[PDB]
Amino acid sequence: GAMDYSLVKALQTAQQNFVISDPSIPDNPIVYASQGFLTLTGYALSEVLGRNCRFLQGPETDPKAVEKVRKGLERGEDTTVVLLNYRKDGSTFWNQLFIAALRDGEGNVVNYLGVQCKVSEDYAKAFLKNE
Ligand SMILES: Cc1cc2nc3c(=O)[nH]c(=O)nc-3n(C[C@H](O)[C@H](O)[C@H](O)COP(=O)(O)O)c2cc1C
Ligand SMILES: [Cl-]
């Protein structure tokens, strides 16, 4: 459950932008989305639950950034990327995206956490250069 994790409760209380996915459901869809995520992206909660978060990507999103995310998920490593994302209205923003495994007491991945932060184009260019 989403509220099993004190990090999730903290981010909820702090009114941050995040989602929780469930990799045991086909296509690793979102099972919880914060209000901040909804406001950032322009989607209603009923439009995001049950969907993989790739709906935020579009033609100007760098496929190499998406590949870094993919590899983090396949290798079990926490990961930070900066990539271009799209709101429901088609407007774009740079997203500094953090994805981490949420584990049980035996080490199994039960859920993934993704935390989104809108950053400026200038911040994004500097981040990508430094990577
Ligand atoms: C918890 C979580 C949150 C994610 N949040 C975003 C996001 O904010 N923006 C984005 O472009 N991709 C995000 N993704 C990445 C996509 O959901 C997806 O993992 C990536 O596009 C590769 O999927 P594929 O291997 O099916 O191509 C997130 C993934 C997870 C697991
Ligand atoms: Cl995925």
mmCIF file of N, CA and C and ligand atoms in Angstrom:
data_model
loop_
_atom_site.group_PDB
_atom_site.id
_atom_site.type_symbol
_atom_site.label_atom_id
_atom_site.label_comp_id
_atom_site.label_asym_id
_atom_site.label_seq_id
_atom_site.Cartn_x
_atom_site.Cartn_y
_atom_site.Cartn_z
ATOM 1 N N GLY A 1 0.836 -1.211 0.000
ATOM 2 C CA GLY A 1 0.000 0.000 0.000
ATOM 3 C C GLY A 1 0.860 1.246 0.000
ATOM 4 N N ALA A 2 0.391 2.316 -0.629
ATOM 5 C CA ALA A 2 1.159 3.553 -0.715
ATOM 6 C C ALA A 2 1.533 4.108 0.645
ATOM 7 N N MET A 3 0.660 4.005 1.625
ATOM 8 C CA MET A 3 0.916 4.590 2.929
ATOM 9 C C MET A 3 1.702 3.632 3.816
ATOM 10 N N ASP A 4 2.234 2.548 3.236
ATOM 11 C CA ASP A 4 3.143 1.634 3.995
ATOM 12 C C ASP A 4 4.521 2.293 4.203
ATOM 13 N N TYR A 5 4.830 3.338 3.432
ATOM 14 C CA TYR A 5 6.191 3.871 3.349
ATOM 15 C C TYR A 5 6.257 5.257 3.983
ATOM 16 N N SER A 6 7.083 5.400 5.011
ATOM 17 C CA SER A 6 7.157 6.726 5.636
ATOM 18 C C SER A 6 7.747 7.791 4.692
ATOM 19 N N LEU A 7 8.552 7.404 3.702
ATOM 20 C CA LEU A 7 9.026 8.396 2.763
ATOM 21 C C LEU A 7 7.887 8.951 1.919
ATOM 22 N N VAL A 8 6.943 8.074 1.566
ATOM 23 C CA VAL A 8 5.772 8.506 0.837
ATOM 24 C C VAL A 8 4.887 9.444 1.681
ATOM 25 N N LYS A 9 4.673 9.051 2.951
ATOM 26 C CA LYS A 9 3.900 9.910 3.833
ATOM 27 C C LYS A 9 4.554 11.267 4.005
ATOM 28 N N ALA A 10 5.887 11.286 4.119
ATOM 29 C CA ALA A 10 6.584 12.553 4.233
ATOM 30 C C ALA A 10 6.392 13.465 3.033
ATOM 31 N N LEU A 11 6.544 12.875 1.840
ATOM 32 C CA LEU A 11 6.413 13.657 0.604
ATOM 33 C C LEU A 11 4.967 14.141 0.416
ATOM 34 N N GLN A 12 4.018 13.332 0.870
ATOM 35 C CA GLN A 12 2.598 13.721 0.858
ATOM 36 C C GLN A 12 2.375 14.955 1.746
ATOM 37 N N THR A 13 2.878 14.863 2.977
ATOM 38 C CA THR A 13 2.696 15.924 3.967
ATOM 39 C C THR A 13 3.363 17.205 3.507
ATOM 40 N N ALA A 14 4.553 17.064 2.923
ATOM 41 C CA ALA A 14 5.297 18.195 2.386
ATOM 42 C C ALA A 14 4.774 18.728 1.040
ATOM 43 N N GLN A 15 3.684 18.128 0.530
ATOM 44 C CA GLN A 15 3.023 18.593 -0.723
ATOM 45 C C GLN A 15 3.960 18.606 -1.937
ATOM 46 N N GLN A 16 4.733 17.525 -2.048
ATOM 47 C CA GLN A 16 5.641 17.328 -3.148
ATOM 48 C C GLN A 16 5.029 16.600 -4.327
ATOM 49 N N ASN A 17 5.768 16.533 -5.430
ATOM 50 C CA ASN A 17 5.256 15.939 -6.689
ATOM 51 C C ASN A 17 5.834 14.540 -6.783
ATOM 52 N N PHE A 18 4.998 13.514 -6.741
ATOM 53 C CA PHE A 18 5.502 12.179 -6.846
ATOM 54 C C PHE A 18 4.393 11.234 -7.259
ATOM 55 N N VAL A 19 4.844 10.059 -7.719
ATOM 56 C CA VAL A 19 3.989 8.923 -8.005
ATOM 57 C C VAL A 19 4.622 7.658 -7.462
ATOM 58 N N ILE A 20 3.786 6.653 -7.254
ATOM 59 C CA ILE A 20 4.198 5.302 -6.881
ATOM 60 C C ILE A 20 3.703 4.362 -7.984
ATOM 61 N N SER A 21 4.580 3.474 -8.476
ATOM 62 C CA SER A 21 4.183 2.483 -9.475
ATOM 63 C C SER A 21 4.264 1.089 -8.878
ATOM 64 N N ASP A 22 3.642 0.131 -9.532
ATOM 65 C CA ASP A 22 3.640 -1.268 -9.108
ATOM 66 C C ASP A 22 4.112 -2.175 -10.236
ATOM 67 N N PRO A 23 5.348 -2.686 -10.154
ATOM 68 C CA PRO A 23 5.896 -3.464 -11.252
ATOM 69 C C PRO A 23 5.284 -4.844 -11.437
ATOM 70 N N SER A 24 4.528 -5.336 -10.468
ATOM 71 C CA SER A 24 3.817 -6.607 -10.634
ATOM 72 C C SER A 24 2.560 -6.496 -11.495
ATOM 73 N N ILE A 25 2.110 -5.260 -11.740
ATOM 74 C CA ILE A 25 0.936 -5.074 -12.634
ATOM 75 C C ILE A 25 1.487 -4.845 -14.033
ATOM 76 N N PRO A 26 0.827 -5.382 -15.084
ATOM 77 C CA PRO A 26 1.378 -5.147 -16.406
ATOM 78 C C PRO A 26 1.668 -3.683 -16.717
ATOM 79 N N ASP A 27 2.864 -3.474 -17.255
ATOM 80 C CA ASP A 27 3.378 -2.199 -17.651
ATOM 81 C C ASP A 27 3.700 -1.227 -16.529
ATOM 82 N N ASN A 28 3.878 -1.749 -15.323
ATOM 83 C CA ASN A 28 4.377 -0.952 -14.208
ATOM 84 C C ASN A 28 3.664 0.391 -14.050
ATOM 85 N N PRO A 29 2.334 0.332 -13.883
ATOM 86 C CA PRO A 29 1.554 1.556 -13.841
ATOM 87 C C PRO A 29 1.575 2.270 -12.495
ATOM 88 N N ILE A 30 1.160 3.510 -12.543
ATOM 89 C CA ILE A 30 0.975 4.346 -11.371
ATOM 90 C C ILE A 30 -0.192 3.792 -10.537
ATOM 91 N N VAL A 31 0.057 3.618 -9.226
ATOM 92 C CA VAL A 31 -0.956 3.202 -8.252
ATOM 93 C C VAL A 31 -1.247 4.321 -7.216
ATOM 94 N N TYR A 32 -0.477 5.407 -7.214
ATOM 95 C CA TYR A 32 -0.735 6.534 -6.335
ATOM 96 C C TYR A 32 -0.081 7.745 -7.008
ATOM 97 N N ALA A 33 -0.771 8.883 -7.026
ATOM 98 C CA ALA A 33 -0.186 10.128 -7.559
ATOM 99 C C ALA A 33 -0.530 11.254 -6.638
ATOM 100 N N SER A 34 0.470 12.066 -6.305
ATOM 101 C CA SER A 34 0.214 13.193 -5.415
ATOM 102 C C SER A 34 -0.487 14.350 -6.073
ATOM 103 N N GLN A 35 -1.123 15.198 -5.287
ATOM 104 C CA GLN A 35 -1.718 16.411 -5.798
ATOM 105 C C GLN A 35 -0.744 17.264 -6.574
ATOM 106 N N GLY A 36 0.485 17.351 -6.093
ATOM 107 C CA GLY A 36 1.502 18.148 -6.759
ATOM 108 C C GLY A 36 1.778 17.640 -8.161
ATOM 109 N N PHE A 37 1.851 16.325 -8.314
ATOM 110 C CA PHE A 37 2.034 15.721 -9.646
ATOM 111 C C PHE A 37 0.886 16.096 -10.575
ATOM 112 N N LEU A 38 -0.325 16.044 -10.066
ATOM 113 C CA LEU A 38 -1.508 16.390 -10.865
ATOM 114 C C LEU A 38 -1.443 17.838 -11.296
ATOM 115 N N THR A 39 -1.092 18.737 -10.381
ATOM 116 C CA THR A 39 -1.019 20.147 -10.707
ATOM 117 C C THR A 39 0.094 20.446 -11.705
ATOM 118 N N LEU A 40 1.236 19.813 -11.514
ATOM 119 C CA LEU A 40 2.390 19.992 -12.416
ATOM 120 C C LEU A 40 2.036 19.571 -13.836
ATOM 121 N N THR A 41 1.440 18.394 -13.970
ATOM 122 C CA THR A 41 1.215 17.794 -15.271
ATOM 123 C C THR A 41 -0.105 18.175 -15.922
ATOM 124 N N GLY A 42 -1.067 18.696 -15.165
ATOM 125 C CA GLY A 42 -2.390 19.021 -15.700
ATOM 126 C C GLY A 42 -3.388 17.884 -15.824
ATOM 127 N N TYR A 43 -3.015 16.661 -15.433
ATOM 128 C CA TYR A 43 -3.897 15.512 -15.519
ATOM 129 C C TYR A 43 -4.713 15.358 -14.257
ATOM 130 N N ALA A 44 -5.940 14.878 -14.370
ATOM 131 C CA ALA A 44 -6.747 14.465 -13.242
ATOM 132 C C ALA A 44 -6.246 13.128 -12.729
ATOM 133 N N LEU A 45 -6.479 12.871 -11.445
ATOM 134 C CA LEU A 45 -6.052 11.595 -10.854
ATOM 135 C C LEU A 45 -6.615 10.382 -11.633
ATOM 136 N N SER A 46 -7.867 10.503 -12.058
ATOM 137 C CA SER A 46 -8.549 9.452 -12.813
ATOM 138 C C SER A 46 -7.953 9.227 -14.198
ATOM 139 N N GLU A 47 -7.090 10.112 -14.678
ATOM 140 C CA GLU A 47 -6.410 9.966 -15.952
ATOM 141 C C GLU A 47 -5.015 9.391 -15.810
ATOM 142 N N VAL A 48 -4.509 9.289 -14.575
ATOM 143 C CA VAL A 48 -3.126 8.835 -14.355
ATOM 144 C C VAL A 48 -3.028 7.462 -13.701
ATOM 145 N N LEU A 49 -3.905 7.167 -12.732
ATOM 146 C CA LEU A 49 -3.852 5.857 -12.110
ATOM 147 C C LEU A 49 -4.075 4.778 -13.162
ATOM 148 N N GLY A 50 -3.296 3.699 -13.081
ATOM 149 C CA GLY A 50 -3.408 2.594 -14.053
ATOM 150 C C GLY A 50 -2.634 2.786 -15.336
ATOM 151 N N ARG A 51 -1.912 3.903 -15.446
ATOM 152 C CA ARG A 51 -1.118 4.238 -16.616
ATOM 153 C C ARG A 51 0.371 4.258 -16.283
ATOM 154 N N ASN A 52 1.208 3.811 -17.210
ATOM 155 C CA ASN A 52 2.648 4.020 -17.131
ATOM 156 C C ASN A 52 2.948 5.499 -17.350
ATOM 157 N N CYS A 53 3.907 6.036 -16.607
ATOM 158 C CA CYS A 53 4.231 7.468 -16.639
ATOM 159 C C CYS A 53 4.856 7.996 -17.980
ATOM 160 N N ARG A 54 5.119 7.093 -18.935
ATOM 161 C CA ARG A 54 5.654 7.517 -20.204
ATOM 162 C C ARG A 54 4.722 8.452 -20.950
ATOM 163 N N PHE A 55 3.455 8.558 -20.563
ATOM 164 C CA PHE A 55 2.564 9.544 -21.181
ATOM 165 C C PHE A 55 3.038 10.990 -21.102
ATOM 166 N N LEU A 56 3.988 11.226 -20.199
ATOM 167 C CA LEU A 56 4.632 12.555 -20.084
ATOM 168 C C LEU A 56 5.672 12.843 -21.142
ATOM 169 N N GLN A 57 6.029 11.827 -21.935
ATOM 170 C CA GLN A 57 7.101 12.000 -22.920
ATOM 171 C C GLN A 57 6.531 12.357 -24.290
ATOM 172 N N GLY A 58 7.350 12.981 -25.107
ATOM 173 C CA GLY A 58 6.915 13.403 -26.439
ATOM 174 C C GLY A 58 8.082 13.551 -27.365
ATOM 175 N N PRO A 59 7.850 14.156 -28.531
ATOM 176 C CA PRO A 59 8.861 14.155 -29.592
ATOM 177 C C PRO A 59 10.184 14.796 -29.239
ATOM 178 N N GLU A 60 10.177 15.796 -28.369
ATOM 179 C CA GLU A 60 11.451 16.416 -28.010
ATOM 180 C C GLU A 60 12.094 15.835 -26.761
ATOM 181 N N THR A 61 11.488 14.814 -26.165
ATOM 182 C CA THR A 61 12.129 14.088 -25.062
ATOM 183 C C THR A 61 13.286 13.267 -25.603
ATOM 184 N N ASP A 62 14.434 13.289 -24.914
ATOM 185 C CA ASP A 62 15.617 12.600 -25.380
ATOM 186 C C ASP A 62 15.457 11.097 -25.091
ATOM 187 N N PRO A 63 15.472 10.222 -26.133
ATOM 188 C CA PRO A 63 15.377 8.777 -25.862
ATOM 189 C C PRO A 63 16.523 8.236 -24.998
ATOM 190 N N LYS A 64 17.673 8.887 -25.040
ATOM 191 C CA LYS A 64 18.789 8.465 -24.184
ATOM 192 C C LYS A 64 18.497 8.672 -22.707
ATOM 193 N N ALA A 65 17.718 9.692 -22.368
ATOM 194 C CA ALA A 65 17.343 9.892 -20.958
ATOM 195 C C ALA A 65 16.399 8.794 -20.552
ATOM 196 N N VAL A 66 15.444 8.473 -21.440
ATOM 197 C CA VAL A 66 14.504 7.401 -21.140
ATOM 198 C C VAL A 66 15.243 6.063 -20.954
ATOM 199 N N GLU A 67 16.268 5.834 -21.755
ATOM 200 C CA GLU A 67 17.088 4.632 -21.629
ATOM 201 C C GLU A 67 17.813 4.573 -20.287
ATOM 202 N N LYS A 68 18.296 5.713 -19.819
ATOM 203 C CA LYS A 68 18.907 5.733 -18.446
ATOM 204 C C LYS A 68 17.914 5.321 -17.356
ATOM 205 N N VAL A 69 16.678 5.795 -17.476
ATOM 206 C CA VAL A 69 15.648 5.392 -16.540
ATOM 207 C C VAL A 69 15.416 3.875 -16.638
ATOM 208 N N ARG A 70 15.272 3.403 -17.874
ATOM 209 C CA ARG A 70 15.021 2.000 -18.104
ATOM 210 C C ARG A 70 16.080 1.123 -17.472
ATOM 211 N N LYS A 71 17.336 1.478 -17.692
ATOM 212 C CA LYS A 71 18.480 0.729 -17.161
ATOM 213 C C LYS A 71 18.504 0.731 -15.627
ATOM 214 N N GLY A 72 18.158 1.850 -15.002
ATOM 215 C CA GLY A 72 18.083 1.916 -13.528
ATOM 216 C C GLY A 72 17.074 0.927 -13.001
ATOM 217 N N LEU A 73 15.926 0.875 -13.668
ATOM 218 C CA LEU A 73 14.881 -0.075 -13.318
ATOM 219 C C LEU A 73 15.323 -1.535 -13.531
ATOM 220 N N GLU A 74 16.003 -1.841 -14.629
ATOM 221 C CA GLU A 74 16.457 -3.198 -14.938
ATOM 222 C C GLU A 74 17.583 -3.671 -13.994
ATOM 223 N N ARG A 75 18.456 -2.741 -13.586
ATOM 224 C CA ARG A 75 19.628 -3.032 -12.728
ATOM 225 C C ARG A 75 19.425 -2.839 -11.254
ATOM 226 N N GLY A 76 18.268 -2.336 -10.867
ATOM 227 C CA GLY A 76 17.957 -2.050 -9.483
ATOM 228 C C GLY A 76 18.791 -0.940 -8.859
ATOM 229 N N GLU A 77 18.994 0.148 -9.575
ATOM 230 C CA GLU A 77 19.757 1.285 -9.051
ATOM 231 C C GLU A 77 18.887 2.527 -9.031
ATOM 232 N N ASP A 78 18.897 3.280 -7.916
ATOM 233 C CA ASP A 78 18.254 4.616 -7.818
ATOM 234 C C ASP A 78 18.851 5.497 -8.906
ATOM 235 N N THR A 79 18.064 6.438 -9.404
ATOM 236 C CA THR A 79 18.474 7.117 -10.609
ATOM 237 C C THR A 79 17.925 8.538 -10.671
ATOM 238 N N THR A 80 18.744 9.467 -11.172
ATOM 239 C CA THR A 80 18.343 10.837 -11.409
ATOM 240 C C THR A 80 18.562 11.115 -12.898
ATOM 241 N N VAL A 81 17.540 11.646 -13.542
ATOM 242 C CA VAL A 81 17.685 12.131 -14.939
ATOM 243 C C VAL A 81 17.015 13.491 -15.040
ATOM 244 N N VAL A 82 17.409 14.245 -16.044
ATOM 245 C CA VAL A 82 16.684 15.460 -16.400
ATOM 246 C C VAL A 82 16.193 15.229 -17.826
ATOM 247 N N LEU A 83 14.901 15.397 -18.021
ATOM 248 C CA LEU A 83 14.328 15.185 -19.363
ATOM 249 C C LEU A 83 13.135 16.077 -19.580
ATOM 250 N N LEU A 84 12.831 16.287 -20.872
ATOM 251 C CA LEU A 84 11.700 17.116 -21.246
ATOM 252 C C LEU A 84 10.407 16.324 -21.156
ATOM 253 N N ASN A 85 9.425 16.894 -20.484
ATOM 254 C CA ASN A 85 8.117 16.270 -20.360
ATOM 255 C C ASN A 85 7.047 17.267 -20.829
ATOM 256 N N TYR A 86 5.865 16.699 -21.045
ATOM 257 C CA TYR A 86 4.718 17.368 -21.658
ATOM 258 C C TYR A 86 3.512 17.300 -20.716
ATOM 259 N N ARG A 87 2.857 18.446 -20.527
ATOM 260 C CA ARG A 87 1.607 18.502 -19.771
ATOM 261 C C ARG A 87 0.454 18.062 -20.669
ATOM 262 N N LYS A 88 -0.724 17.890 -20.066
ATOM 263 C CA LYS A 88 -1.926 17.488 -20.800
ATOM 264 C C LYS A 88 -2.193 18.485 -21.915
ATOM 265 N N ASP A 89 -1.955 19.776 -21.660
ATOM 266 C CA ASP A 89 -2.199 20.817 -22.685
ATOM 267 C C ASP A 89 -1.109 20.920 -23.767
ATOM 268 N N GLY A 90 -0.072 20.061 -23.689
ATOM 269 C CA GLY A 90 0.999 20.036 -24.674
ATOM 270 C C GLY A 90 2.162 20.950 -24.358
ATOM 271 N N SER A 91 2.051 21.789 -23.321
ATOM 272 C CA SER A 91 3.167 22.627 -22.917
ATOM 273 C C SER A 91 4.260 21.723 -22.330
ATOM 274 N N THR A 92 5.496 22.189 -22.423
ATOM 275 C CA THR A 92 6.637 21.396 -21.980
ATOM 276 C C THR A 92 7.302 21.976 -20.761
ATOM 277 N N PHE A 93 8.001 21.103 -20.048
ATOM 278 C CA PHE A 93 8.796 21.506 -18.899
ATOM 279 C C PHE A 93 9.944 20.544 -18.764
ATOM 280 N N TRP A 94 11.024 21.024 -18.153
ATOM 281 C CA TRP A 94 12.148 20.144 -17.805
ATOM 282 C C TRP A 94 11.887 19.534 -16.438
ATOM 283 N N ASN A 95 12.060 18.226 -16.354
ATOM 284 C CA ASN A 95 11.758 17.439 -15.161
ATOM 285 C C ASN A 95 13.069 16.817 -14.688
ATOM 286 N N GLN A 96 13.516 17.199 -13.469
ATOM 287 C CA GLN A 96 14.557 16.437 -12.769
ATOM 288 C C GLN A 96 13.854 15.356 -12.007
ATOM 289 N N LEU A 97 13.981 14.124 -12.523
ATOM 290 C CA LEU A 97 13.231 12.972 -12.103
ATOM 291 C C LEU A 97 14.119 12.037 -11.303
ATOM 292 N N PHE A 98 13.639 11.672 -10.116
ATOM 293 C CA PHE A 98 14.305 10.686 -9.241
ATOM 294 C C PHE A 98 13.434 9.446 -9.171
ATOM 295 N N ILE A 99 14.028 8.276 -9.411
ATOM 296 C CA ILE A 99 13.278 7.024 -9.282
ATOM 297 C C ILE A 99 14.058 6.095 -8.372
ATOM 298 N N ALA A 100 13.326 5.509 -7.430
ATOM 299 C CA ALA A 100 13.923 4.614 -6.435
ATOM 300 C C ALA A 100 13.011 3.431 -6.148
ATOM 301 N N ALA A 101 13.644 2.297 -5.875
ATOM 302 C CA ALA A 101 12.926 1.133 -5.392
ATOM 303 C C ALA A 101 12.475 1.318 -3.947
ATOM 304 N N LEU A 102 11.255 0.896 -3.668
ATOM 305 C CA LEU A 102 10.708 0.750 -2.314
ATOM 306 C C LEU A 102 10.674 -0.730 -2.008
ATOM 307 N N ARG A 103 11.382 -1.156 -0.976
ATOM 308 C CA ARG A 103 11.638 -2.543 -0.698
ATOM 309 C C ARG A 103 10.943 -3.027 0.554
ATOM 310 N N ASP A 104 10.671 -4.318 0.588
ATOM 311 C CA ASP A 104 10.191 -4.988 1.808
ATOM 312 C C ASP A 104 11.378 -5.405 2.716
ATOM 313 N N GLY A 105 11.054 -6.042 3.836
ATOM 314 C CA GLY A 105 12.047 -6.446 4.803
ATOM 315 C C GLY A 105 12.989 -7.577 4.390
ATOM 316 N N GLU A 106 12.691 -8.198 3.224
ATOM 317 C CA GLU A 106 13.559 -9.204 2.648
ATOM 318 C C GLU A 106 14.310 -8.672 1.424
ATOM 319 N N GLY A 107 14.149 -7.387 1.127
ATOM 320 C CA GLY A 107 14.860 -6.770 0.044
ATOM 321 C C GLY A 107 14.161 -6.752 -1.286
ATOM 322 N N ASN A 108 12.962 -7.322 -1.365
ATOM 323 C CA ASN A 108 12.263 -7.380 -2.652
ATOM 324 C C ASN A 108 11.791 -6.004 -3.003
ATOM 325 N N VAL A 109 11.844 -5.646 -4.289
ATOM 326 C CA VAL A 109 11.198 -4.433 -4.769
ATOM 327 C C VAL A 109 9.688 -4.671 -4.747
ATOM 328 N N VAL A 110 8.958 -3.818 -4.045
ATOM 329 C CA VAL A 110 7.508 -3.900 -3.977
ATOM 330 C C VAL A 110 6.898 -2.805 -4.832
ATOM 331 N N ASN A 111 7.462 -1.626 -4.818
ATOM 332 C CA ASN A 111 6.950 -0.489 -5.576
ATOM 333 C C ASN A 111 8.130 0.346 -6.047
ATOM 334 N N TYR A 112 7.890 1.250 -7.007
ATOM 335 C CA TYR A 112 8.845 2.303 -7.295
ATOM 336 C C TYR A 112 8.269 3.658 -6.949
ATOM 337 N N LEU A 113 9.146 4.529 -6.449
ATOM 338 C CA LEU A 113 8.835 5.903 -6.172
ATOM 339 C C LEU A 113 9.446 6.756 -7.262
ATOM 340 N N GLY A 114 8.675 7.717 -7.773
ATOM 341 C CA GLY A 114 9.226 8.698 -8.698
ATOM 342 C C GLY A 114 8.877 10.081 -8.218
ATOM 343 N N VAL A 115 9.884 10.931 -8.084
ATOM 344 C CA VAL A 115 9.706 12.297 -7.612
ATOM 345 C C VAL A 115 10.112 13.259 -8.711
ATOM 346 N N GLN A 116 9.212 14.167 -9.082
ATOM 347 C CA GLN A 116 9.427 15.080 -10.196
ATOM 348 C C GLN A 116 9.692 16.481 -9.661
ATOM 349 N N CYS A 117 10.677 17.155 -10.221
ATOM 350 C CA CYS A 117 10.912 18.563 -9.953
ATOM 351 C C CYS A 117 11.081 19.346 -11.215
ATOM 352 N N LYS A 118 10.215 20.328 -11.408
ATOM 353 C CA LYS A 118 10.345 21.222 -12.544
ATOM 354 C C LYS A 118 11.584 22.083 -12.348
ATOM 355 N N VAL A 119 12.430 22.116 -13.359
ATOM 356 C CA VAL A 119 13.647 22.922 -13.363
ATOM 357 C C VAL A 119 13.703 23.819 -14.604
ATOM 358 N N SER A 120 14.513 24.872 -14.564
ATOM 359 C CA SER A 120 14.633 25.785 -15.698
ATOM 360 C C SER A 120 15.434 25.142 -16.812
ATOM 361 N N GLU A 121 15.270 25.671 -18.015
ATOM 362 C CA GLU A 121 16.044 25.237 -19.177
ATOM 363 C C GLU A 121 17.551 25.438 -18.923
ATOM 364 N N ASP A 122 17.929 26.565 -18.312
ATOM 365 C CA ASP A 122 19.325 26.820 -17.994
ATOM 366 C C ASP A 122 19.855 25.796 -16.994
ATOM 367 N N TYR A 123 19.066 25.465 -15.967
ATOM 368 C CA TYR A 123 19.478 24.428 -14.992
ATOM 369 C C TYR A 123 19.617 23.083 -15.710
ATOM 370 N N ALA A 124 18.663 22.759 -16.564
ATOM 371 C CA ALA A 124 18.673 21.503 -17.306
ATOM 372 C C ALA A 124 19.913 21.374 -18.178
ATOM 373 N N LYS A 125 20.257 22.431 -18.905
ATOM 374 C CA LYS A 125 21.438 22.370 -19.780
ATOM 375 C C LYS A 125 22.725 22.154 -18.986
ATOM 376 N N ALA A 126 22.823 22.820 -17.846
ATOM 377 C CA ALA A 126 23.995 22.660 -16.972
ATOM 378 C C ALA A 126 24.064 21.239 -16.388
ATOM 379 N N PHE A 127 22.907 20.691 -16.009
ATOM 380 C CA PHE A 127 22.859 19.347 -15.462
ATOM 381 C C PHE A 127 23.344 18.344 -16.505
ATOM 382 N N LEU A 128 22.804 18.458 -17.726
ATOM 383 C CA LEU A 128 23.138 17.522 -18.776
ATOM 384 C C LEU A 128 24.595 17.597 -19.200
ATOM 385 N N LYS A 129 25.146 18.794 -19.178
ATOM 386 C CA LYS A 129 26.545 18.964 -19.451
ATOM 387 C C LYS A 129 27.476 18.295 -18.431
ATOM 388 N N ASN A 130 27.069 18.376 -17.163
ATOM 389 C CA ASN A 130 27.820 17.819 -16.053
ATOM 390 C C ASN A 130 27.707 16.304 -15.895
ATOM 391 N N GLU A 131 26.697 15.724 -16.481
ATOM 392 C CA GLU A 131 26.451 14.305 -16.424
ATOM 393 C C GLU A 131 27.560 13.623 -17.261
HETATM 394 C C1 LIG B 1 7.822 5.522 -10.301
HETATM 395 C C2 LIG B 1 8.095 6.029 -11.736
HETATM 396 C C3 LIG B 1 7.911 7.334 -12.054
HETATM 397 C C4 LIG B 1 8.181 7.836 -13.346
HETATM 398 N N1 LIG B 1 7.978 9.150 -13.610
HETATM 399 C C5 LIG B 1 8.274 9.598 -14.872
HETATM 400 C C6 LIG B 1 8.167 10.985 -15.177
HETATM 401 O O1 LIG B 1 7.843 11.852 -14.322
HETATM 402 N N2 LIG B 1 8.452 11.363 -16.460
HETATM 403 C C7 LIG B 1 8.876 10.475 -17.391
HETATM 404 O O2 LIG B 1 9.127 10.891 -18.546
HETATM 405 N N3 LIG B 1 9.025 9.155 -17.144
HETATM 406 C C8 LIG B 1 8.763 8.690 -15.902
HETATM 407 N N4 LIG B 1 8.901 7.354 -15.656
HETATM 408 C C9 LIG B 1 9.496 6.489 -16.668
HETATM 409 C C10 LIG B 1 8.514 5.688 -17.527
HETATM 410 O O3 LIG B 1 7.403 5.298 -16.706
HETATM 411 C C11 LIG B 1 9.209 4.442 -18.057
HETATM 412 O O4 LIG B 1 9.777 3.659 -16.993
HETATM 413 C C12 LIG B 1 10.283 4.704 -19.088
HETATM 414 O O5 LIG B 1 9.712 5.521 -20.125
HETATM 415 C C13 LIG B 1 10.770 3.362 -19.731
HETATM 416 O O6 LIG B 1 9.640 2.446 -19.916
HETATM 417 P P1 LIG B 1 9.790 1.334 -21.074
HETATM 418 O O7 LIG B 1 10.964 0.487 -20.600
HETATM 419 O O8 LIG B 1 8.503 0.605 -21.116
HETATM 420 O O9 LIG B 1 10.089 2.065 -22.316
HETATM 421 C C14 LIG B 1 8.685 6.895 -14.331
HETATM 422 C C15 LIG B 1 8.838 5.559 -13.988
HETATM 423 C C16 LIG B 1 8.571 5.098 -12.721
HETATM 424 C C17 LIG B 1 8.793 3.660 -12.380
HETATM 425 CL CL CL B 2 8.450 1.053 -16.481
#
